[PDB]
Each structure stands twice: as C-alpha cells, then as structure tokens.
C-alpha cells in the first residue's frame, strides 16, 4: 500500500499508489522510501 515500487499502465486511472510518498514530498520533502512496511520520508 505504501512500499509498492512496482508500476503499471494507468494513465488517468484510479490505481493503488504510495500516497504517503507524494504526501510527505508535496508537504515538506522531495524523495520517499519505505522500511519494513513503514513510511519513510527522504530528500
């Protein structure tokens, strides 16, 4: 749900994606990572 690096052909289609990532980024970050199913923000 968060540690999903795999991607598929979904241009404009509702598909499960790492929300925590884009969240922290757009919030006050740039990069994103996961650890043992745990959301981790990075530069």
PDB file of N, CA and C in Angstrom:
ATOM      1  N   UNK A   1       0.825  -1.203   0.000  1.00  0.00           N
ATOM      2  CA  UNK A   1       0.000   0.000   0.000  1.00  0.00           C
ATOM      3  C   UNK A   1       0.862   1.257   0.000  1.00  0.00           C
ATOM      4  N   UNK A   2       2.054   1.151   0.580  1.00  0.00           N
ATOM      5  CA  UNK A   2       2.975   2.279   0.648  1.00  0.00           C
ATOM      6  C   UNK A   2       4.341   1.909   0.082  1.00  0.00           C
ATOM      7  N   UNK A   3       4.769   0.679   0.340  1.00  0.00           N
ATOM      8  CA  UNK A   3       6.059   0.200  -0.145  1.00  0.00           C
ATOM      9  C   UNK A   3       5.906  -0.512  -1.485  1.00  0.00           C
ATOM     10  N   UNK A   4       5.109   0.074  -2.372  1.00  0.00           N
ATOM     11  CA  UNK A   4       4.879  -0.503  -3.691  1.00  0.00           C
ATOM     12  C   UNK A   4       5.641   0.270  -4.763  1.00  0.00           C
ATOM     13  N   UNK A   5       6.800  -0.253  -5.153  1.00  0.00           N
ATOM     14  CA  UNK A   5       7.625   0.388  -6.170  1.00  0.00           C
ATOM     15  C   UNK A   5       7.152   0.021  -7.571  1.00  0.00           C
ATOM     16  N   UNK A   6       6.598  -1.178  -7.709  1.00  0.00           N
ATOM     17  CA  UNK A   6       6.104  -1.650  -8.998  1.00  0.00           C
ATOM     18  C   UNK A   6       5.101  -0.665  -9.590  1.00  0.00           C
ATOM     19  N   UNK A   7       5.097  -0.556 -10.915  1.00  0.00           N
ATOM     20  CA  UNK A   7       4.188   0.351 -11.604  1.00  0.00           C
ATOM     21  C   UNK A   7       3.506  -0.350 -12.776  1.00  0.00           C
ATOM     22  N   UNK A   8       2.374   0.197 -13.207  1.00  0.00           N
ATOM     23  CA  UNK A   8       1.622  -0.375 -14.318  1.00  0.00           C
ATOM     24  C   UNK A   8       1.087   0.722 -15.235  1.00  0.00           C
ATOM     25  N   UNK A   9       0.533   0.315 -16.372  1.00  0.00           N
ATOM     26  CA  UNK A   9      -0.016   1.263 -17.335  1.00  0.00           C
ATOM     27  C   UNK A   9      -1.365   1.798 -16.864  1.00  0.00           C
ATOM     28  N   UNK A  10      -1.331   2.898 -16.119  1.00  0.00           N
ATOM     29  CA  UNK A  10      -2.550   3.511 -15.606  1.00  0.00           C
ATOM     30  C   UNK A  10      -2.528   5.023 -15.801  1.00  0.00           C
ATOM     31  N   UNK A  11      -2.707   5.458 -17.044  1.00  0.00           N
ATOM     32  CA  UNK A  11      -2.709   6.880 -17.364  1.00  0.00           C
ATOM     33  C   UNK A  11      -4.103   7.476 -17.194  1.00  0.00           C
ATOM     34  N   UNK A  12      -4.358   8.053 -16.024  1.00  0.00           N
ATOM     35  CA  UNK A  12      -5.652   8.652 -15.759  1.00  0.00           C
ATOM     36  C   UNK A  12      -6.649   7.655 -15.200  1.00  0.00           C
ATOM     37  N   UNK A  13      -6.140   6.615 -14.548  1.00  0.00           N
ATOM     38  CA  UNK A  13      -6.995   5.588 -13.966  1.00  0.00           C
ATOM     39  C   UNK A  13      -6.711   5.415 -12.477  1.00  0.00           C
ATOM     40  N   UNK A  14      -7.772   5.261 -11.692  1.00  0.00           N
ATOM     41  CA  UNK A  14      -7.638   5.083 -10.252  1.00  0.00           C
ATOM     42  C   UNK A  14      -6.927   3.774  -9.925  1.00  0.00           C
ATOM     43  N   UNK A  15      -5.715   3.880  -9.391  1.00  0.00           N
ATOM     44  CA  UNK A  15      -4.930   2.705  -9.032  1.00  0.00           C
ATOM     45  C   UNK A  15      -4.163   2.931  -7.733  1.00  0.00           C
ATOM     46  N   UNK A  16      -4.034   1.875  -6.938  1.00  0.00           N
ATOM     47  CA  UNK A  16      -3.324   1.957  -5.667  1.00  0.00           C
ATOM     48  C   UNK A  16      -1.909   2.491  -5.869  1.00  0.00           C
ATOM     49  N   UNK A  17      -1.557   3.522  -5.108  1.00  0.00           N
ATOM     50  CA  UNK A  17      -0.232   4.126  -5.201  1.00  0.00           C
ATOM     51  C   UNK A  17       0.230   4.636  -3.840  1.00  0.00           C
ATOM     52  N   UNK A  18       1.542   4.783  -3.683  1.00  0.00           N
ATOM     53  CA  UNK A  18       2.113   5.259  -2.428  1.00  0.00           C
ATOM     54  C   UNK A  18       1.690   6.698  -2.150  1.00  0.00           C
ATOM     55  N   UNK A  19       0.608   6.856  -1.395  1.00  0.00           N
ATOM     56  CA  UNK A  19       0.101   8.179  -1.054  1.00  0.00           C
ATOM     57  C   UNK A  19       1.022   8.882  -0.064  1.00  0.00           C
ATOM     58  N   UNK A  20       1.529   8.126   0.905  1.00  0.00           N
ATOM     59  CA  UNK A  20       2.423   8.677   1.917  1.00  0.00           C
ATOM     60  C   UNK A  20       3.614   9.376   1.267  1.00  0.00           C
ATOM     61  N   UNK A  21       4.125   8.787   0.191  1.00  0.00           N
ATOM     62  CA  UNK A  21       5.261   9.353  -0.524  1.00  0.00           C
ATOM     63  C   UNK A  21       4.944  10.752  -1.041  1.00  0.00           C
ATOM     64  N   UNK A  22       4.065  10.825  -2.035  1.00  0.00           N
ATOM     65  CA  UNK A  22       3.676  12.103  -2.619  1.00  0.00           C
ATOM     66  C   UNK A  22       3.234  13.085  -1.538  1.00  0.00           C
ATOM     67  N   UNK A  23       2.676  12.552  -0.455  1.00  0.00           N
ATOM     68  CA  UNK A  23       2.214  13.380   0.653  1.00  0.00           C
ATOM     69  C   UNK A  23       3.379  14.122   1.301  1.00  0.00           C
ATOM     70  N   UNK A  24       4.312  13.365   1.869  1.00  0.00           N
ATOM     71  CA  UNK A  24       5.477  13.948   2.524  1.00  0.00           C
ATOM     72  C   UNK A  24       6.227  14.878   1.573  1.00  0.00           C
ATOM     73  N   UNK A  25       6.372  14.447   0.326  1.00  0.00           N
ATOM     74  CA  UNK A  25       7.066  15.241  -0.681  1.00  0.00           C
ATOM     75  C   UNK A  25       6.398  16.599  -0.867  1.00  0.00           C
ATOM     76  N   UNK A  26       5.184  16.586  -1.407  1.00  0.00           N
ATOM     77  CA  UNK A  26       4.436  17.817  -1.635  1.00  0.00           C
ATOM     78  C   UNK A  26       4.334  18.641  -0.356  1.00  0.00           C
ATOM     79  N   UNK A  27       4.332  17.959   0.783  1.00  0.00           N
ATOM     80  CA  UNK A  27       4.238  18.628   2.076  1.00  0.00           C
ATOM     81  C   UNK A  27       5.508  19.418   2.374  1.00  0.00           C
ATOM     82  N   UNK A  28       6.568  18.706   2.744  1.00  0.00           N
ATOM     83  CA  UNK A  28       7.842  19.340   3.056  1.00  0.00           C
ATOM     84  C   UNK A  28       9.004  18.389   2.781  1.00  0.00           C
ATOM     85  N   UNK A  29       8.983  17.763   1.609  1.00  0.00           N
ATOM     86  CA  UNK A  29      10.034  16.830   1.222  1.00  0.00           C
ATOM     87  C   UNK A  29      10.171  16.762  -0.296  1.00  0.00           C
ATOM     88  N   UNK A  30      11.024  15.860  -0.769  1.00  0.00           N
ATOM     89  CA  UNK A  30      11.245  15.692  -2.201  1.00  0.00           C
ATOM     90  C   UNK A  30      11.286  14.214  -2.576  1.00  0.00           C
ATOM     91  N   UNK A  31      11.946  13.416  -1.743  1.00  0.00           N
ATOM     92  CA  UNK A  31      12.045  11.992  -2.003  1.00  0.00           C
ATOM     93  C   UNK A  31      11.221  11.166  -1.036  1.00  0.00           C
ATOM     94  N   UNK A  32      11.147   9.862  -1.286  1.00  0.00           N
ATOM     95  CA  UNK A  32      10.381   8.983  -0.421  1.00  0.00           C
ATOM     96  C   UNK A  32      10.931   7.570  -0.399  1.00  0.00           C
ATOM     97  N   UNK A  33      10.708   6.868   0.707  1.00  0.00           N
ATOM     98  CA  UNK A  33      11.189   5.499   0.854  1.00  0.00           C
ATOM     99  C   UNK A  33      10.367   4.742   1.893  1.00  0.00           C
ATOM    100  N   UNK A  34      10.516   3.422   1.908  1.00  0.00           N
ATOM    101  CA  UNK A  34       9.787   2.580   2.850  1.00  0.00           C
ATOM    102  C   UNK A  34      10.738   1.642   3.588  1.00  0.00           C
ATOM    103  N   UNK A  35      10.346   1.239   4.792  1.00  0.00           N
ATOM    104  CA  UNK A  35      11.163   0.340   5.600  1.00  0.00           C
ATOM    105  C   UNK A  35      10.288  -0.586   6.437  1.00  0.00           C
ATOM    106  N   UNK A  36      10.346  -1.879   6.136  1.00  0.00           N
ATOM    107  CA  UNK A  36       9.558  -2.870   6.860  1.00  0.00           C
ATOM    108  C   UNK A  36       8.086  -2.470   6.900  1.00  0.00           C
ATOM    109  N   UNK A  37       7.568  -2.022   5.760  1.00  0.00           N
ATOM    110  CA  UNK A  37       6.177  -1.616   5.686  1.00  0.00           C
ATOM    111  C   UNK A  37       5.919  -0.303   6.399  1.00  0.00           C
ATOM    112  N   UNK A  38       6.981   0.462   6.633  1.00  0.00           N
ATOM    113  CA  UNK A  38       6.863   1.746   7.312  1.00  0.00           C
ATOM    114  C   UNK A  38       7.212   2.897   6.374  1.00  0.00           C
ATOM    115  N   UNK A  39       6.368   3.923   6.367  1.00  0.00           N
ATOM    116  CA  UNK A  39       6.586   5.086   5.516  1.00  0.00           C
ATOM    117  C   UNK A  39       7.759   5.919   6.024  1.00  0.00           C
ATOM    118  N   UNK A  40       8.715   6.186   5.139  1.00  0.00           N
ATOM    119  CA  UNK A  40       9.889   6.973   5.497  1.00  0.00           C
ATOM    120  C   UNK A  40      10.159   8.058   4.460  1.00  0.00           C
ATOM    121  N   UNK A  41      10.242   9.301   4.922  1.00  0.00           N
ATOM    122  CA  UNK A  41      10.497  10.431   4.036  1.00  0.00           C
ATOM    123  C   UNK A  41      11.996  10.661   3.864  1.00  0.00           C
ATOM    124  N   UNK A  42      12.386  11.128   2.683  1.00  0.00           N
ATOM    125  CA  UNK A  42      13.789  11.389   2.389  1.00  0.00           C
ATOM    126  C   UNK A  42      13.933  12.524   1.380  1.00  0.00           C
ATOM    127  N   UNK A  43      15.160  13.002   1.204  1.00  0.00           N
ATOM    128  CA  UNK A  43      15.431  14.088   0.269  1.00  0.00           C
ATOM    129  C   UNK A  43      15.748  13.542  -1.120  1.00  0.00           C
TER     130      UNK A  43
END
